[PDB]
C-alpha cells in the first residue's frame, strides 16, 4: 500500500557465518597453583560463574565440521603455546658429541614385584659416557648417562653412538617447573559474535541441525594429545557415532566416538634417579643417573571384557555403512613410531604403547554368541625422551626423567581408524580397519564438532505504517 | 563400493570428427589420456573441469550415472588410450585409430 514506510529495528535476532578471534577462559579453581602449566596459562580470563545456554526453538542451522575454522585456530594456539614455553629453557647443543655406550649393569633383587612378567628395562637402555664442558669453557669433564635405545642411533665404529636429533635440529630441555597437565580451555567470542551449538544426540559432522542452541563459550576442552585413541574426552550422548568426511574415500580418517568410557591404566614400574651435571655457564642437564629397585617394562592395563563389548558395538555401527561385508581390525601397517604405537603423556613421561591385542580380530557374521571369562590385557609400552610431536613443525624437546614410580588412569573416548582400499580381494566380503591416522587436528574435531561461530546483525529494515513526524 | 564400466572398448573414428566415449561411475570421475608406454596425463577432473594446459578441444559433461568425453576437431596427435578414473578403480580404457 501507499501507507508503508521504511522502519529501522535495532536488536534484531539475525546472524551470518563468520570467522573471528576466540580468546581463552579458564576456571580459577584450577588456577593459583603456581605450577606454570603450558596450555591454559595465567593469561586466560576467569570463566563465567553462570554460563548461559539459550535454546532456540524453531531454528534449523547447517553445521559442517571438516571445514570449521575453530579447529584451525586451536591448532595455531596449541603449537604457539608449546614453542613459547620452551623458549627460556636450556639448549642441549653440547650433548651432540660422540657417545660410547655399553650394556647397563644394576644391583637389586626385586622379583618382579607383581604379576606381570613383560620383561625388564635391561636391553632397552644403554650406559653411555661422553665428554662435556665444565662451567669453564677450556675444561672438559667425562660424564655418563642412561639413554633409551630409541634416543640414540649408532653412526659407525660399533659401541659409538649419537643422539637422533643431532642431524635434524637442536632440542631444548623442558624446564623443571613447567607442567604438562592438560586443564580445560573455554573458547569465547567477542561481543557481537556468538557460538551456535548442535544439541542433536545422533548427529554426524555435516547437515542441518534441528536443535540449535546459543552459547558464548565452548565447554572445557582439554588439549590432551594422543595418536590412536582419544583420551579424557567427552562421551557421546545418544550412541556410538562414526564420523568421516567421506566414508567412500579411504584417504580420510574415520573418527569413532564412544558412548561408554573404557578405562586404560598405565604405569612405569621402574625407579629412575634424576641427577644433574653442568654442561655450560648457567646450563644444567638432567639425566637418569641410575635405575635401582624395581626394573620392569612399562605397561598399560585394559579390562578385556569391556574392550570386547566396546569393540563389538562399534562393528555394529560399521556394518550399517558397510552392509554385506565382514569387518576386521588389524595393527598399523607402518609409518613413524607415533603412528604405529599409542603415544600419550603422563606426568611429563612420554609413552608409546603397542596396542596390537586391541586391534587384532575378525567379525565374520556373528552367527553365534561366543563367551569368555574376564581377562586383563597388558600392553607393553616404551618411554622416549627426545620428543617431536608436531611432525617436525614445532620445537624439539627433551623430557627430564621423573623421580619415582609413575601411574596414570585415563578414559578412552574414541578411536581413529583408517580403512584400506582395494579392487577385487578387498571386495570379497571383508573390510580391514587399522588404528591411527589423520593428524592432531582430528584430536580436536572430536570436541569442536558441535560448534559454529557466527556474527550478529542487529539492524533490521521492515515496512510499517509509522511515518516520522516532520516539524 | 564403486561401480563403473566403459562400454566402448575400441572405435575407429576418422580424422576431424567429434567422438564421445561414455563411462558410468558411482563417484568422482577424472579423464586421463595415455600414449604407448607413457605416463598418463590429466585432461578433465570431476567430469567437467578443464585442466590448466590442455587445449579447449577436450571437454566432458555429466548427467546421472554417465559421463561423456568429447574430442571435437580430432588431430593426428590426439591418438592415445583414454581413462575414466575413480578413487582407486580404473578400467582398461579405449584406444583410438584412423
Amino acid at each position, epitope marked *: 500500500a501507499e501507507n508503508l514506510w521504511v522502519t529501522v529495528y535495532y536488536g534484531v535476532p539475525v546472524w551470518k557465518d563468520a570467522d573471528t578471534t576466540l580468546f581463552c577462559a579458564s576456571d580459577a579453581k584450577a588456577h593459583e597453583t603456581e605450577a606454570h602449566n603450558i596450555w591454559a596459562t595465567h593469561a586466560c580470563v576467569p570463566t563465567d560463574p553462570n554460563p548461559q545456554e539459550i535454546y532456540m526453538e524453531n531454528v534449523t542451522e547447517n553445521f559442517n565440521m571438516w571445514k570449521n575454522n575453530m579447529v584451525e585456530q586451536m591448532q595455531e594456539d596449541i603449537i604457539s603455546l608449546w614453542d613459547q614455553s620452551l623458549k627460556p629453557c636450556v639448549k642441549l647443543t653440547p650433548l651432540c658429541v660422540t657417545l660410547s655406550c655399553t650394556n647397563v649393569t644394576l644391583t637389586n633383587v626385586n622379583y618382579t614385584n607383581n604379576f606381570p612378567n613383560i620383561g625388564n628395562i635391561t636391553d632397552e637402555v644403554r650406559n653411555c659416557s661422553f665428554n662435556v664442558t665444565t662451567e669453564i669453557r677450556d675444561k672438559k669433564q667425562k660424564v655418563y648417562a642412561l639413554f633409551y635405545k630409541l634416543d640414540i642411533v649408532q653412526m659407525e665404529n660399533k659401541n659409538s653412538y649419537r643422539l637422533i636429533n643431532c642431524n635434524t635440529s637442536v632440542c631444548k630441555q623442558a624446564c623443571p617447573k613447567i607442567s604438562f597437565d592438560p586443564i580445560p580451555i573455554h573458547y569465547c567470542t567477542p561481543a557481537g559474535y556468538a557460538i551456535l551449538k548442535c544439541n542433536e544426540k545422533n548427529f554426524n559432522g555435516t547437515g542441518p541441525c534441528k536443535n540449535v542452541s546459543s552459547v558464548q563459550c565452548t565447554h572445557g576442552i582439554k588439549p590432551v594429545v594422543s595418536t590412536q585413541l582419544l583420551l579424557n574426552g567427552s562421551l557421546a550422548e545418544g550412541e556410538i557415532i562414526i564420523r568421516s568426511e567421506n566414508l567412500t574415500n579411504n584417504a580420510k580418517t574415520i573418527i569413532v566416538h564412544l558412548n561408554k568410557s573404557v578405562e586404560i591404566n598405565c604405569t612405569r614400574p621402574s625407579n629412575n634417579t634424576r641427577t644433574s651435571v653442568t654442561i655450560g655457564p648457567g646450563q644444567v642437564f638432567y639425566r637418569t643417573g641410575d635405575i635401582i629397585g624395581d626394573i620392569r617394562k612399562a605397561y598399560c592395563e585394559i579390562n578385556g571384557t569391556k574392550w570386547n563389548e566396546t569393540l563389538k558395538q562399534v562393528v555394529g555401527k560399521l556394518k550399517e555403512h558397510f552392509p554385506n561385508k565382514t569387518i576386521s581390525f588389524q595393527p598399523p601397517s607402518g609409518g613413524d613410531l607415533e603412528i604405529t604405537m599409542h603415544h600419550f603423556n603422563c606426568r611429563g613421561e612420554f609413552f608409546y604403547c603397542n596396542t596390537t591385542q586391541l586391534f587384532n580380530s575378525t567379525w565374520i557374521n556373528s552367527t553365534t554368541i561366543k563367551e569368555y571369562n574376564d581377562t586383563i590385557i597388558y600392553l607393553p609400552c616404551k618411554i622416549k625422551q627426545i620428543i617431536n610431536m608436531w611432525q617436525g613443525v614445532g620445537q624439539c624437546m627433551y623430557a627430564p626423567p621423573i623421580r619415582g614410580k609413575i601411574n596414570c588412569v585415563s578414559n578412552i573416548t574414541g578411536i581413529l581408524l583408517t580403512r584400506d582400499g582395494g579392487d577385487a580381494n578387498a571386495t570379497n566380503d571383508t573390510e580391514t580397519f587399522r588404528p*591411527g591416522g589423520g593428524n592432531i587436528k582430528d584430536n580436536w574435531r572430536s570436541e569442536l564438532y558441535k560448534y559454529k561461530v557466527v556474527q550478529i546483525e542487529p539492524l533490521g529494515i521492515a515496512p510499517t505504517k509509522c511515518k516520522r513526524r516532520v516539524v | 563400493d564403486i561401480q563403473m564400466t566403459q562400454s566402448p572398448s575400441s572405435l575407429s573414428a576418422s580424422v576431424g570428427d567429434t567422438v564421445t566415449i561414455t563411462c558410468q561411475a558411482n563417484g568422482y570421475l*577424472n579423464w586421463y589420456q595415455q600414449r604407448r608406454g607413457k605416463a598418463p596425463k590429466l585432461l578433465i*577432473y570431476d567430469g567437467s573441469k578443464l585442466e590448466r594446459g590442455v587445449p579447449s578441444r577436450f571437454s566432458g559433461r555429466r548427467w546421472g550415472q554417465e559421463y561423456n568425453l568429447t574430442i571435437n576437431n580430432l588431430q593426428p596427435e590426439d591418438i592415445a588410450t583414454y*581413462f575414466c578414473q*575413480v578413487y*582407486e*578403480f580404473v578400467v582398461p580404457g579405449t584406444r583410438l585409430d584412423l
Partner: nanobody
Amino acid sequence: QVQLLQSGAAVTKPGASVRVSCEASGYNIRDYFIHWWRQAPGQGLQWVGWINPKTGQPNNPRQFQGRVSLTRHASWDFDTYSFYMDLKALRSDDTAVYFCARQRSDYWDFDVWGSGTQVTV
C-alpha cells in the same frame, strides 16, 4: 615447476626384492599424498597404495599385504623427498611399469606422474 623423477629400469630374479625410487622436489611435498600405480604390459593401471608424506603411514590393498612396503625419506629442510617402493617376493606377475603419482585434491586428481620404471623378472 613440479617434477617426480624416477629411477632406471630394474631386472631381477624370482623371489628377490626390488627398490623403486621416486623423487619430488618442486612443491610442498608434505601436503599431498603420493600414490603408486602398477601397469602390467598390455593391461590397465592398478592401484598399489598411498603414503602420507607427513607421517609415512602407508595403505595398500589386500593383494599387496606383506609384500609392498612404502617408505619416504625427507631432506633436512624438506625441500626434496625420496619415496621408495619395495617388493619382497616376486613372481612373473610382477612384471610391470610402476608410477609414482601426486594426488592433488579430494577428487584424487593425479596431475603429476613419474616417467615410469620397468620392473621385469
